């Protein structure tokens, strides 16, 4: 009599799907994997770097049935998107266990579709947890696994020996593009928290607590004569922040969240970078060798490339009560200052229609005119600016 993984996978593999994407940028086509989250609604989570700039998206199940899927939400700071199958009929969903119960040593089963071969199941263990640094701006609290993972496994499920989803395979480290035993998966709890935000609002309510800081190494804990050699070090607290309202002093070290120990600041930043605004949570602290516990609640939180895509170095916003888009600060040699946007300009209108705020501006931007003509003003002067 032999032990095996077949009875668990026969209940789980219908849940994992292979995805096909058609795009344009130099037109492109991409392939990857996806995981059915909700059976009836047809929600299929995948990587955002899989399905971006996608004109046509067709999802193929394990049995070969084809479907058409519509984008619903995307969150590139953490690389999780969500699509919805059209006319869902007879699908299988995956149970998601708590990823915070994972430990280095647990066995993992990776499911995906490398190179369009088909649904490929591979075996491994949890190599390490709480890893980040691939893209230091991204929200990454990656799981590390030696489970075999190559091009196409992305968006595929990482499950324990019970078939419960413990992570979404995201990226690998390969100096040759082939797997050498290092795969990375976003924990299921970050996916559980980011999938539940795209269901209600279609995008993420990126909440902020209001503390700045940096990693706690072994050298800094010797200087601060703090016991713990890892955690989140509070360099400063922002005024008027809910965190400041709770009683957080600068120089304090964070050690736990909801009781769960903290592997690193970038992990803690990534953990809470997913929870919606107003999530109540508990924190373990260490200020002057004393343990401090406090509960909290998120508050709410602009580039010209957050309005244009491609035009950096010009921070803008609204002005007054519908008085135009003011330019707050401009850096020399940035994609806005190359056309003539200076600091202080009050964008009054464009293409013979008034611009009172970032909203009225986007009424003709999305009308996509060939050439654009701003009617900003450099103080007392009335000037015009042209683009494209």
């Amino acid at each position: 009599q032999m032990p095996s993984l077949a009875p668990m996978l026969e209940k789980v593999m219908p849940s994992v799907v292979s995805i096909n994407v058609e795009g344009s940028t130099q037109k492109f086509m991409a392939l990857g994997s996806g995981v059915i989250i909700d059976a009836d609604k047809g929600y299929v989570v995948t990587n955002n770097h899989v399905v971006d700039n996608a004109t046509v998206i067709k999802v193929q199940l394990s049995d070969g049935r084809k479907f058409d899927a519509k984008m619903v939400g995307k969150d590139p700071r953490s690389d999780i998107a969500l699509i919805q199958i059209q006319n869902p009929k007879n699908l299988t969903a995956i149970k998601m266990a708590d990823s915070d119960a994972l430990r280095v040593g647990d066995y993992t089963v990776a499911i995906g579709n490398p190179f369009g071969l088909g649904e490929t199941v591979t075996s491994g263990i949890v190599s390490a947890l709480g890893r980040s640094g691939l893209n230091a701006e991204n929200y990454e609290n990656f799981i590390q696994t030696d489970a075999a993972i190559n091009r196409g496994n992305a968006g595929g499920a990482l499950v324990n020996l019970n078939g419960e989803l413990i992570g979404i395979n995201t990226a690998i480290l390969a100096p040759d593009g082939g797997n050498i035993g290092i795969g990375f998966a976003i924990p299921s709890n970050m996916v559980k928290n980011l999938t539940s935000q795209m269901v209600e609002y279609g995008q993420v309510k990126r909440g902020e607590l209001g503390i700045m800081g940096t990693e706690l190494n072994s050298e800094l804990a010797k200087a601060m004569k703090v016991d713990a050699q890892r955690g989140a070090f509070v360099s400063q607290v922002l005024p008027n922040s809910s965190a400041a309202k709770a009683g957080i002093k600068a120089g304090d070290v964070i050690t736990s969240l909801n009781g769960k120990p903290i592997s690193s600041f970038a992990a803690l930043r990534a953990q809470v970078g997913t929870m919606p605004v107003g999530s109540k949570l508990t924190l373990g602290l260490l200020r002057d060798g004393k343990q401090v516990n406090v509960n909290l609640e998120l508050q709410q939180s602009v580039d010209s490339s957050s309005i244009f895509n491609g035009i950096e170095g010009a921070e803008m916003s609204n002005k007054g009560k519908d008085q135009g888009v003011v330019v707050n600060n401009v850096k020399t040699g940035t994609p806005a200052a190359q056309i003539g946007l200076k600091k202080g300009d009050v964008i009054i209108g464009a293409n013979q229609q008034a611009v009172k705020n970032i909203a009225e501006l986007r009424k003709v931007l999305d009308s996509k005119p060939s050439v654009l003509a701003l009617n900003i003003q450099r103080g007392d002067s009335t000037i015009y600016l042209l683009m494209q």
Partner: peptide
């Protein structure tokens, strides 16, 4: 370096 939350 530093990072916000």
């Amino acid at each position: 370096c530093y990072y916000k939350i």
